[PDB]
Write a protein that binds this ligand. Sequence first.
Ligand SMILES: [Br-]
Ligand SMILES: [Br-]
Ligand SMILES: [Br-]
Ligand SMILES: [Br-]
Ligand SMILES: [Br-]
Ligand SMILES: [Br-]
Ligand SMILES: [Br-]
Ligand SMILES: [Br-]
Ligand SMILES: [Br-]
Ligand SMILES: [Br-]
Ligand SMILES: [Br-]
Ligand SMILES: [Br-]
Ligand SMILES: [Br-]
Ligand SMILES: [Br-]
Ligand SMILES: [Br-]
Ligand SMILES: [Br-]
Ligand SMILES: [Br-]
Ligand SMILES: [Br-]
Ligand SMILES: [Br-]
Lengths: 89, 85
Amino acid sequence: GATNATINFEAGILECYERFSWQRALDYPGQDRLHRLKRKLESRIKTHNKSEPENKRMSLEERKAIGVKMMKVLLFMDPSAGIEGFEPY
Amino acid sequence: QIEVGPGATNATINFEAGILECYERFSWQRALDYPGQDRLHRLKRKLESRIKTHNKSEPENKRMSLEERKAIGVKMMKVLLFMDP
Ligand SMILES: [Br-]
Ligand SMILES: [Br-]
Ligand SMILES: [Br-]
Ligand SMILES: [Br-]
Ligand SMILES: [Br-]
Ligand SMILES: [Br-]
Ligand SMILES: [Br-]
Ligand SMILES: [Br-]
Ligand SMILES: [Br-]
Ligand SMILES: [Br-]
Ligand SMILES: [Br-]
Ligand SMILES: [Br-]
Ligand SMILES: [Br-]
Ligand SMILES: [Br-]
Ligand SMILES: [Br-]
Ligand SMILES: [Br-]
Ligand SMILES: [Br-]
Ligand SMILES: [Br-]
Ligand SMILES: [Br-]
């Protein structure tokens, strides 16, 4: 529910920790935090997906893309994936 | 783990202050379940403590409040949000 939405949002959040860690900006307790979040969302995704029909199931990967989009919208940024898609103004 | 420089302390505080801002924005979608609300409140509480401790560890002209650090965090979040590996 609010559980699905919250999972997808948290999957975007995870993707951002990951991107930041890739750029060597995430500190060591931050990377512990990233590992806890990934394990926790994995277990939460397994459970949520097990309680829905086949066609209402989504991998972590798909969900990350959903949460990244949510994050863009909330921060008032163009919602399109990737570096392509900006408007001029 | 990934090896990082001393710059990552402040960067991670700023980053996480951007994260917190996002949770806060998402919350106003009432889309945030109880474990999500607890994660947000705990984030804010721990970040305030880290900010106070880090600021107390720095000159004065480098000290920054939570609201200033969120502003830095959101700047970083634009860059990150549009470069997908
Ligand atoms: Br959603
Ligand atoms: Br450290
Ligand atoms: Br932490
Ligand atoms: Br993604
Ligand atoms: Br903003
Ligand atoms: Br934009
Ligand atoms: Br898209
Ligand atoms: Br779009
Ligand atoms: Br993206
Ligand atoms: Br890209
Ligand atoms: Br537009
Ligand atoms: Br490394
Ligand atoms: Br550094
Ligand atoms: Br920074
Ligand atoms: Br978080
Ligand atoms: Br809340
Ligand atoms: Br706040
Ligand atoms: Br300050
Ligand atoms: Br403040």
